[PDB]
Design a protein around this ligand. Sequence first.
Ligand SMILES: Nc1ncnc2c1ncn2[C@@H]1O[C@H](COP(=O)(O)OP(=O)(O)OP(=O)(O)OP(=O)(O)OP(=O)(O)OC[C@H]2O[C@@H](n3cnc4c(N)ncnc43)[C@H](O)[C@@H]2O)[C@@H](O)[C@H]1O
Ligand SMILES: [Mg+2]
Ligand SMILES: [Zn+2]
Length: 217
Amino acid sequence: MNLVLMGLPGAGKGTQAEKIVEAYGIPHISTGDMFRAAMKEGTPLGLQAKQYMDRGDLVPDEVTIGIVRERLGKDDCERGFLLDGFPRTVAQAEALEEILEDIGRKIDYVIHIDVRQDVLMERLTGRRICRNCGATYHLIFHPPAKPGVCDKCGGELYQRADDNEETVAKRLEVNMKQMKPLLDFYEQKGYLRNVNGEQDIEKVFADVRELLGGLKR
Ligand SMILES: Nc1ncnc2c1ncn2[C@@H]1O[C@H](COP(=O)(O)OP(=O)(O)OP(=O)(O)OP(=O)(O)OP(=O)(O)OC[C@H]2O[C@@H](n3cnc4c(N)ncnc43)[C@H](O)[C@@H]2O)[C@@H](O)[C@H]1O
Ligand SMILES: [Mg+2]
Ligand SMILES: [Zn+2]
């Protein structure tokens, strides 16, 4: 399974990626996760990315493409992979085609989790994640068994810096501008498939398993 997840900030991509990885054993590759880990470590790329992420802007194309090229060339990607929130621009998608031609690992399907913008502010301001393993919760929609504690590793939950009302409105504007050109790129390829993201979390995952059932595991 060679897969991409696309969708607006807060649509449910991370939530569904956790369930796909647990079921099928393929590597989870999230560019947002990679940039936040680098920022916490204080590396030159992490400090560059921080200026863009704090505002709600996208990180420039070529440095982003470069970290993806290197990750996908690893041995653990031989029998499949899941890209979560990359690509984000048509220039990223064009580069990704050339990378996969070269290593012989072409995309099976692009999964678009479709959610309208009027519900996304409430999704993002109540999001809480695990400091140690990244597991995703929501104080109203999907709370942990014990308050402030991860169900998976027992670590402390926290609110991301970028999940504030002012930075969320900027993220929605920036990412919406890229949606129609990216969706048109993959529709013309023939392997874009749509999922209704405005359902219960377990029903969204059911529809995702139904999409993926024709692939070898
Ligand atoms: N390729 C690239 N190019 C350039 N720059 C890049 C880049 N990638 C990253 N960057 C930079 O890095 C930053 C961060 O990137 P990114 O982290 O990828 O954050 P985002 O891009 O803003 O996407 P999120 O990770 O925000 O949302 P999600 O769809 O995964 O939803 P979730 O499952 O958590 O769910 C949301 C909430 O709702 C809940 N929820 C999930 N599903 C449902 C449901 N069905 N019903 C109710 N609630 C639900 C969850 O519990 C959760 O609390 C960017 O702004 C940019 O600066
Ligand atoms: Mg994510
Ligand atoms: Zn955890």
